[PDB]
Structure formats: structure tokens, C-alpha cells
Amino acid sequence: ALETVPKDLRHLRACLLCSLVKTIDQFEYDGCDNCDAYLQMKGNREMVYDCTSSSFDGIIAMMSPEDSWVSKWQRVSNFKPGVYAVSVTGRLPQGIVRELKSRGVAYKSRDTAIKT
Amino acid sequence: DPNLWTVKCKIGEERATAISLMRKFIAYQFTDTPLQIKSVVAPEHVKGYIYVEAYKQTHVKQAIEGVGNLRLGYWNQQMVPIKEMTDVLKV
């Protein structure tokens, strides 16, 4: 919804798990809207910097994951409508990755770009 | 799957046109005239025109009958080749 819709072009940075592209303002006010329960994106900034990537190539204004071959490719047919990044450059800390694995959420890298 | 249509936009203002059209879609999605298009692609290295993901040129026209930046392409639209979806999103 409009809450997930970014408001300005300043300080855009994409998440590492759902590749959600939103500004620091709504990351502070709400954090993530996809895996907030699994990540605790809200209430801090240092861990937000580690759990979000400022380098993303290409974005998609997907709204219908259930009938999108875009969503098929980028494995967000199960996530909500929103703005997602085609490529995300970064990786979670080993501690957070281990925590997610223990909770049963394997971390799949969103870096789909072809490195040479 | 929906097909891509090439619509001409003011040089250097494709991003602004995309933002404006998505804002208008937000404002008019709950109205009696929602936008039936699925998405819009504005490649970083493509200037002069953008791609609209829709099933019909009628849908494309009804979506682009907003800001005047797309007036030149409003008269007619051009299909994107079937093989060209893979190339559309390459960076």
C-alpha cells in the first residue's frame, strides 16, 4: 500500500531478504513490511544498516505476485504487493543468518546480477 | 502473460513520468477508472521511451492518457518482440 510506497528518491536502499526498496524514514517508522516478525527491523539503525543494502540494480513495481512471471523469476510470488529490487548487493551477518536458519527461514541471496 | 508496449516519453524525464503515472494509479485505483496495466519499465540506459506491461493497446492508451509527456506516443504504440522480455530487464 501507500505505506510501502516510498515517498522520495533520497536515501533509497533495498532489504537483503525480500529486496524491499524503501527509504530510511519508513524503515525507522515501521521497518520491513514482509519479514519484520522474523527480522526485528524496527527500533534500531546499526542492525538496519547491516540488514539492508544500499546498492540495488533495477526495481519492479509488482502488485500481482499471483499472476506475474516476473514474480515467478524473482521468487516473490509469495510476498505482498510492493516495490522490489531485481538485484541486491550484500549479505546478512553470519549471526543473523544462523538465527534465521534456526527459526527455519533459510536466507536466499537476492544478488541475481551476473558477476562477469 | 501481458505484453510490453513501447511508449515515447520526454527525453530525460522517463523516471518522473513513471513516478507520476504510478502516483495517479494510486490515486485512481479505487475509482471507476482503474489502470488495467500491470507495471512499467524505465531502463536506466534507455532514454526517449519506456515500456508498459499490458494486454491491449487500449489498456496502454487508457494508462498513458495522463501527463502530456506521453502525448507523442499516445497516437500509436509499438509491440515489444516476444523474445525481447529477457533483454528488457538486462543491466
Curated annotation (Swiss-Prot), chain A:
The residues listed in the UniProt record as binding Zn(2+), with positions renumbered to this chain, are 15, 18, 32, 35
Identify a single GO molecular function assigned to this protein.
RNA polymerase II complex binding
What InterPro entries does the database record attribute to this sequence? RPABC4/Spt4, Spt4, Spt4/RpoE2_Znf, Spt4_sf
**Leader sequence residues:** none
Keywords of the record: Acetylation, Activator, Metal-binding, Nucleus, Repressor, Transcription, Transcription regulation, Ubl conjugation, Zinc, Zinc-finger
**Gene Ontology, cellular component aspect:** DSIF complex; nucleoplasm; nucleus
> Which residues are recorded as modified (N-acetylalanine)?
1
Task: Give me any GO biological process, just one.
Answer: regulation of transcription elongation by RNA polymerase II
Q: Where expressed (tissues)?
A: Widely expressed.
* Places the protein is found: Nucleus
Region annotation (Interaction with SUPT5H) ranges? 1-39
Q: How is it modified after translation?
A: Ubiquitinated by UBR5 when not assembled in the DSIF complex, leading to its degradation: UBR5 recognizes and binds a degron that is not accessible when SUPT4H1 is part of the DSIF complex.
Residues in C4-type zinc fingers run 15-35
Q: What Pfam family is a match for this entry? A: Spt4
* Disulfides per UniProt: none
In terms of PANTHER family, this protein maps to: SUPPRESSOR OF TY 4, TRANSCRIPTION ELONGATION FACTOR SPT4
Give the UniProt family note: Belongs to the SPT4 family.
Function per UniProt: Component of the DRB sensitivity-inducing factor complex (DSIF complex), which regulates mRNA processing and transcription elongation by RNA polymerase II. DSIF positively regulates mRNA capping by stimulating the mRNA guanylyltransferase activity of RNGTT/CAP1A. DSIF also acts cooperatively with the negative elongation factor complex (NELF complex) to enhance transcriptional pausing at sites proximal to the promoter. Transcriptional pausing may facilitate the assembly of an elongation competent RNA polymerase II complex.
Q: How does it assemble?
A: Interacts with SUPT5H to form DSIF. DSIF interacts with the positive transcription elongation factor b complex (P-TEFb complex), which is composed of CDK9 and cyclin-T (CCNT1 or CCNT2). DSIF interacts with RNA polymerase II (Pol II); forms DNA and RNA clamps that stabilize Pol II elongation complex while maintaining the nontemplate DNA strand in the transcription bubble and nascent RNA in the exit channel. This interaction is reduced by phosphorylation of the C-terminal domain (CTD) of POLR2A by P-TEFb.
Instruction: State the name under which the record lists this protein.
Output: Transcription elongation factor SPT4
Q: Which organism is this protein's natural source?
A: Homo sapiens
Whichever gene encodes this chain, its name is SUPT4H1
Curated annotation (Swiss-Prot), chain B:
- Annotated stretches, region: Interaction with SUPT4H1: 1-91
Tissue specificity note: Ubiquitously expressed.
Recorded superkingdom: Eukaryota
Q: How is it modified after translation?
A: Methylated by PRMT1/HRMT1L2 and PRMT5/SKB1. Methylation negatively regulates interaction with P-TEFb and RNA polymerase II. Phosphorylated by CDK7 and CDK9. Phosphorylation by P-TEFb (CDK9) at Thr residues of the C-terminal repeats alleviates transcriptional pausing and promotes transcription elongation. Dephosphorylated by the INTAC complex when transcripts are unfavorably configured for transcriptional elongation, leading to premature transcription termination: dephosphorylation is mediated by the PPP2CA component of the INTAC complex. Dephosphorylated by the PNUTS-PP1 complex in termination zones downstream of poly(A) sites, thereby promoting deceleration of RNA polymerase II transcription.
- Disulfide bonds, which pairs? none
Q: Where in the cell is it found?
A: Nucleus
Outcome (variant: residue 75 to A): Reduces the affinity for Pol II elongation complex
- Which residues lie in coiled coils? none
Tell me the impact of changing residue 76 to A.
Reduces the affinity for Pol II elongation complex
Protein family according to the UniProt entry:
Belongs to the SPT5 family.
Q: What does the record note on quaternary structure?
A: Interacts with SUPT4H1 to form DSIF. DSIF interacts with the positive transcription elongation factor b complex (P-TEFb complex), which is composed of CDK9 and cyclin-T (CCNT1 or CCNT2). DSIF interacts with RNA polymerase II (Pol II); forms DNA and RNA clamps that stabilize Pol II elongation complex while maintaining the nontemplate DNA strand in the transcription bubble and nascent RNA in the exit channel. This interaction is reduced by phosphorylation of the C-terminal domain (CTD) of POLR2A by P-TEFb.
Q: What the protein does?
A: Component of the DRB sensitivity-inducing factor complex (DSIF complex), which regulates mRNA processing and transcription elongation by RNA polymerase II. DSIF positively regulates mRNA capping by stimulating the mRNA guanylyltransferase activity of RNGTT/CAP1A. DSIF also acts cooperatively with the negative elongation factor complex (NELF complex) to enhance transcriptional pausing at sites proximal to the promoter. Transcriptional pausing may facilitate the assembly of an elongation competent RNA polymerase II complex.
Q: Indicate what this protein is called per its UniProt record.
A: Transcription elongation factor SPT5
> Native species of this protein?
Homo sapiens
* Upper taxonomic lineage: Eukaryota, Metazoa, Chordata, Craniata, Vertebrata
Q: Report the portion of the entire protein shown.
A: 176 to 266 of 1087
